[PDB]
Design a protein around this ligand. Structure first.
Ligand SMILES: [Ca+2]
Ligand code: NA
Ligand code: NA
Ligand code: NA
Ligand code: NA
Lengths: 103, 104, 103, 104
């Protein structure tokens, strides 16, 4: 259906118009930076391969969770605690953003 | 008790009434496609029985998560990372939608 | 601080004013009903004690997840799939509700 | 690049500016209290080392979840059920707040 494509394209255009908003770019860079930091930390402190440090960082920051790995060191546990709250602060940031864009 | 039933039906209607919004429909289709790709990827790449691939696909895309399975290959891990962001993208889409539908 | 208590009490009052809203009561009954159904299903089909069937139902419907139990039967997996989407439909229901209450 | 920094600071300000809302403060305090009770309960009832009880408390209240630990006692299971709903109650509170702060 042509209607379907046109509607999708419009939506895709509206989505791309967000990656041009400064506040969104910030939130975006911040989560990327957060993901990098997590990758480094877990790779360093918990001794995970970079790929598994990124996976755990992603899965943790998004609340998906990992069914097998749990931080083994106390420093890792403390970091994960703060990491999770950064993630929540980030999502509220995006939520609030989407909220204001409805005004 | 009657009020409950009447409210339920009124709300239920509004829900099905939302299944009429073209943008909602696309979000929905996108989710199904996402779920199918996921099922295909995990069955193929991770060798999970089809039903187990849809399950992992569903619990992962919804952030529920699976307490026993985690992708075993680097290809799976990378795919899952992106898969998850697709899901978050889809949820914000629905939320943005619900937000717009509240304001007009 | 008296200010703190008064603010909390006001918030608590506003929260209780929700349990009087018909649409909220519905959403509330529905999730309770959903939790009951899950408890029954998992207790029956997956052979979990009622307490563990409720736990898994709660943890699943809220996206928290269980780090040890995963449905063992195909019927359980299919049910959990639909169960999760009911849960998401429920949360959007509450979200939409809170959204309209901001108007 | 300068715009980025200027936007970051403007946003950062608004965040700290929100740490001034009495209702936000209460939500925050409630969360900490919730996290402390949780830490106490799981250390006491489930016998988890304190730091492990705060961790489980945090990942559970945020729906992230723990892939290795699950409460072993019926008392823990029941408490966790309620703990989770408290967390959902708190999140809707914050969301309701963010919603009101957007409209005025
Ligand atoms: Ca596990
Ligand atoms: Na969530
Ligand atoms: Na999990
Ligand atoms: Na989870
Ligand atoms: Na989650």
């Amino acid at each position: 259906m042509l209607s379907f494509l046109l509607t999708l394209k419009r939506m895709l255009r509206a989505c791309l118009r967000a990656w041009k908003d400064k506040e969104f770019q910030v939130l975006f860079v911040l989560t990327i930076l957060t993901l990098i930091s997590g990758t480094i930390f877990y790779s360093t402190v918990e001794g995970l391969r970079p790929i598994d440090a990124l996976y755990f960082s992603v899965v943790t920051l998004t609340t998906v969770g990992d069914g097998n790995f749990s931080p083994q060191t106390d420093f890792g546990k403390i970091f994960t605690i703060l990491y999770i709250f950064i993630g929540i602060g980030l999502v509220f940031g995006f939520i609030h953003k989407l909220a204001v864009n409805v005004q």
